[PDB]
Scaffold this active site. Structure first.
Site, short mmCIF file in Angstrom:
data_model
loop_
_atom_site.label_atom_id
_atom_site.label_comp_id
_atom_site.label_asym_id
_atom_site.label_seq_id
_atom_site.Cartn_x
_atom_site.Cartn_y
_atom_site.Cartn_z
N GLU A 140 0.84 -1.27 0.00
CA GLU A 140 0.00 0.00 0.00
C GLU A 140 0.85 1.28 0.00
O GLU A 140 0.80 2.08 1.00
CB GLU A 140 -0.90 -0.04 1.22
CG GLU A 140 -1.95 -1.20 1.08
CD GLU A 140 -3.06 -1.27 2.12
OE1 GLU A 140 -3.20 -0.37 3.00
OE2 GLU A 140 -3.83 -2.24 2.05
N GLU A 229 -4.33 -8.75 -0.48
CA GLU A 229 -4.82 -8.39 0.87
C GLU A 229 -6.19 -7.79 0.88
O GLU A 229 -6.44 -6.82 0.18
CB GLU A 229 -3.88 -7.39 1.63
CG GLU A 229 -4.16 -7.36 3.13
CD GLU A 229 -3.47 -6.22 3.83
OE1 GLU A 229 -2.23 -6.03 3.69
OE2 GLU A 229 -4.15 -5.52 4.63
#
Length: 390
Positions: A140, A229
């Site tokens: 991220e 994820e």
């Protein structure tokens, strides 16, 4: 004889890589021996996971804590992917982002040192019997309030000018929400793209209309596509057995597979009170949702074109085992009404499906076989259920 669906075994879509979850033995306890088997075994009451994700710690002294779980996962037939959150702190500098001070980035003059850090993790794991399938540039990079930010252009520069030196498959960019601005510059630059092996994406807040990716269909030949994820629909404490809520997990999986053409689907923490394994080591309702895919859609199976939403609240996906051309169908009925589907599978010589069914009051209960008439399998789906046909 309500709705109808066709499975077209000749229209092959993505090859399935697998299903699994995160282990993070620095932030939380490692999986125990029992739990490693429960996650990565495919016996009765095991999740049948074939993907383990781990993190690349900024402090190389923690690297040894990943070993026992990863070895055990590979031994049980899983592959392993690793993602970093932060470079070692001597490679990081602070900057102001959108008015917020003290944010972290990788120094422009440490991209080479970072490549070496990643390579060292790869080498170390390999020396300890864990040949990583892939390693990631950054977890991220576009939601890095608490870790290391990378702009699209900083990711592109790393991918174009540095990533070809990495001694493993390279995964990128792991956008928190599969935001295409993170990855479009990679696909659009031929050298960045050549250094890419796995386009990875997380699904937090990702709506179904944002699951297709035209630019990857056009330019991504030879690259894998992984959802590395998510937790859905929330991470509420003790929420893992909530019903019908847990159907949201099955439906997300479905959508990743069928609207996103994802090859892998990876949860966050395997063991957690909102995860597929509960704190007592047993499988949650969310867990059983994953298991409808993970136990039966094995790596190397190939998704095929199938009527995805035959009637309101019913969602179907199908994957082919190319060894014998057998099919696995996972059908979700979120309706409060029972549903009957005539599933046409033209050209198959299969004539019997077994089926396993989860509702609020049972998990993967084996139910009566379906006998085809000709090439059509008439199935009935209980209210608020998922069923895998094998």
């Amino acid at each position: 004889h309500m709705a109808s669906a066709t499975i077209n075994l000749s229209a092959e879509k993505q090859v399935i890589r697998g299903f699994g979850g995160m282990n993070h033995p620095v932030w939380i306890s490692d999986l125990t021996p029992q739990q490693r088997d429960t996650a990565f075994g495919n016996g009765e009451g095991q999740l049948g996971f074939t993907i383990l994700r781990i993190h690349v710690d900024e402090n190389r002294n923690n690297w040894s804590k990943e070993v026992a779980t990863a070895r055990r996962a590979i031994e049980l037939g899983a592959i392993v992917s690793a993602s970093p959150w932060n470079p070692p702190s001597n490679m990081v500098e602070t900057f102001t982002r959108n008015g917020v001070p003290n944010q972290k980035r990788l120094r422009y003059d440490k991209y080479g040192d970072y490549v070496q850090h990643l390579n060292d993790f790869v080498a170390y794991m390999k020396s300890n019997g864990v040949d990583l399938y892939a390693i990631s540039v950054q977890n991220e990079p576009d939601y890095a309030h608490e870790w290391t930010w990378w702009t699209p252009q900083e990711m592109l520069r790393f991918m174009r000018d540095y990533a070809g030196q990495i001694n493993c498959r390279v995964m990128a960019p792991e956008s928190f929400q599969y935001l295409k601005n993170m990855s479009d510059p990679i696909l659009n630059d031929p050298q960045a793209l050549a250094n890419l092996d796995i386009l990875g994406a997380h699904f937090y807040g990702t709506t179904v209309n944002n699951m297709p990716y035209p630019l990857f269909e056009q330019k991504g030949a030879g690259k894998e596509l992984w959802m590395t994820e998510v937790y859905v629909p929330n991470s509420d404490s003790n929420s893992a057995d909530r019903w019908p809520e847990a159907l949201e997990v099955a439906h997300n999986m479905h959508n990743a597979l069928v609207e996103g053409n994802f090859q892998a689907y990876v949860w966050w923490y395997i063991r957690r009170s909102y995860g597929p394994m509960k704190e007592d080591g047993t499988i949650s309702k969310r867990g059983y949702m994953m298991a409808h895919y993970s136990k039966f859609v094995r790596p190397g199976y190939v998704r095929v074109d199938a009527t995805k939403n035959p009637t309101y609240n019913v969602y179907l996906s199908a994957c082919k085992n190319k060894k014998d051309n057998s099919v696995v169908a996972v059908v979700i009925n979120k309706s409060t009404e029972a549903k009957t589907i005539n599933i046409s599978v033209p050209g198959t010589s299969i004539r019997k499906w077994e089926r396993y069914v989860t509702t609020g009051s049972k998990n993967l209960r084996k139910e009566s076989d379906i006998n085809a008439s000709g090439t059509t399998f008439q199935v009935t789906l209980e209210p608020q259920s998922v069923t895998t046909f094998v």
